[PDB]
Design a protein around this ligand. Structure first.
Ligand SMILES: *[C@@H]1O[C@H](CO)[C@@H](O)[C@H](O)[C@H]1NC(C)=O
Length: 497
């Protein structure tokens, strides 16, 4: 339908410019015959998810790298892709005029956009909020009579989530995570800093905090929104650090284990929300496998834990094998899910870099690495930020795939958006990762999955400056002859029958 309007801000690639009357968009999906493939291509040079078609042929004319689909080798099924509806994201979206708001949400959620099916929802305030608050700030309300949703939920997040669901290509799953409890439940009586829940698992503080999870779920249910999952705490390890500047609530893995076993699991299980899934950790990958061992080797905790939620800060190293790989080997029946990613966080990096091809590559590279190590979904942080990386009540420090300029009723879609879209648009829930064998050593990142209807999807990322001649083989169909240009990403799709 509508092409990217490119704008350069001096970085390695362009953003695509959207406003109240224009945004780039796709036509409805259209299914070419067996023996034809579809290719979507983005490039640092400015191509943005451009569609082309070609033959899958009986003969094989390439003599370079071969990637062979191995459909009989089955790995994990995919839950989904999305991002976080923080206060900051919501403030930014709602700063646009209604037509521009609709074009932004369609970009993320519709079939005319990139088909997101996950939204992460903070339970009250975090750093990406313009003030500190929880849902129960009235002290010593252990029964949570005065628990309530503020305007950040009722006016900003909830209406936006409704509108996202309405435009959604696919059913969307909501995931909730708390940063801090009420400060009267905390050892340090503060929203941030080194402090945990008061007392010990099983006690009044621990029971009220678990009840707060149910009150939250009740409150959202009254606004006709239901959750797929909750995490046991956002980044529990953060609340163990002296001076931690952002809302937090510290748990050791042992404290998390015991809170889940004694309070949170039993409380959720005894509620009307017993079908909500509980994810543990929700923290950096270098905490694994140790946290998984602590929590999941205790049957009393393990029985309430559906999965392990992981974060990563993409500017940092964290070898996937020793963390994700080992966790899967030790606990092969507990799903791994990536619940937050971000980029730009080092002191010297600009928070927002409009058109950074590098940051797009960091996104797609991380998704590929996650899918190659058993992870069933991948969730961005803020859906949108302002050009400074805000608002954040502490400090702006990370980027976002959509940047809003309210002064101009415009938003920019960063390379990150299209790199995420190369996966999110083309990997519906219930797609399954399958074998894809590289015939020789190479500089590409690639992953193959099979849609629920049996059709193939392959993503090929080239983070090098050099074009790579490539043949993709599907045993049931033939040979797809192609080229992965330097600094490109492609998604190939095809019927197998
Ligand atoms: C919105 O963008 C389109 C396409 O670039 C352009 O034709 C139009 O001028 C824009 N609207 C405003 C008010 O600048």
């Amino acid at each position: 339908a509508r092409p990217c309007i490119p704008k350069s801000f001096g970085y390695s690639s362009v953003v695509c410019v959207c406003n109240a009357t224009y945004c780039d968009s796709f036509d409805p999906p259209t299914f070419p015959a067996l023996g034809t493939f579809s290719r979507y291509e983005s490039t640092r040079s400015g191509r943005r998810m451009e569609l082309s078609m070609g033959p899958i042929q009986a003969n094989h004319t390439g003599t370079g790298l071969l990637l062979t689909l191995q459909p009989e080798q089955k790995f994990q099924k995919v839950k989904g892709f999305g991002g976080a509806m923080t206060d900051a994201a919501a403030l930014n979206i709602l700063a646009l005029s209604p037509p521009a708001q609709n074009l932004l949400l369609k970009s993320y959620f519709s079939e005319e956009g990139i088909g997101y099916n996950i939204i992460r929802v903070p339970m009250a305030s975090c750093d990406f909020s313009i003030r500190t608050y929880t849902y129960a700030d009235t002290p010593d309300d252990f029964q949570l009579h005065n628990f309530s949703l503020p305007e950040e939920d009722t006016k900003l997040k909830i209406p936006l989530i409704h509108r996202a669901l309405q435009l959604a290509q696919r059913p969307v799953s909501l995931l909730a995570s708390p940063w801090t409890s009420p400060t009267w439940l905390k050892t340090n009586g503060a929203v941030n800093g080194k402090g945990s829940l008061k007392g010990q698992p099983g006690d009044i503080y621990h029971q009220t905090w678990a009840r707060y999870f149910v009150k939250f779920l009740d409150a959202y249910a009254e606004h006709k929104l239901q959750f797929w999952a909750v995490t046991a705490e956002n980044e529990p390890s953060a609340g163990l650090l002296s001076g931690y500047p952002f809302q937090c609530l510290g748990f050791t893995p042992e404290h998390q284990r015991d809170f889940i076993a004694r309070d949170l699991g039993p409380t959720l299980a005894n509620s009307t929300h017993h079908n909500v899934r509980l994810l543990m950790l929700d923290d950096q990958r270098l905490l694994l496998p140790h946290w998984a061992k602590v929590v999941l080797t205790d049957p009393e905790a393990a029985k309430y834990v559906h999965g392990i939620a992981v974060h990563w800060y993409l500017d940092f190293l964290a070898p996937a094998k020793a963390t994700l790989g080992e966790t899967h080997r030790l606990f092969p029946n507990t799903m791994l899910f990536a619940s937050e990613a971000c980029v730009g966080s080092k002191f010297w990096e600009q928070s927002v870099r409009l058109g950074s091809w590098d940051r797009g590559m960091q996104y797609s590279h991380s998704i590929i690495t996650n899918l190659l190590y058993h992870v069933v979904g991948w969730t961005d942080w803020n859906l949108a930020l302002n050009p400074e990386g805000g608002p954040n009540w502490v400090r702006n420090f990370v980027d976002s795939p959509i940047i809003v300029d309210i002064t101009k009723d415009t938003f920019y879609k960063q390379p990150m958006f299209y790199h995420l879209g190369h996966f999110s648009k083309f990997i519906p829930e219930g797609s399954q990762r399958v074998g894809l064998v590289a015939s020789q050593k190479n500089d590409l990142d690639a992953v193959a999955l099979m849609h629920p209807d049996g059709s193939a999807v392959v993503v090929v990322l080239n983070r090098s400056s050099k074009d790579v001649p490539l043949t993709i083989k599907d045993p049931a169909v033939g040979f797809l002859e192609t080229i992965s240009p330097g600094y490109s990403i492609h998604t190939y799709l095809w019927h197998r029958q």
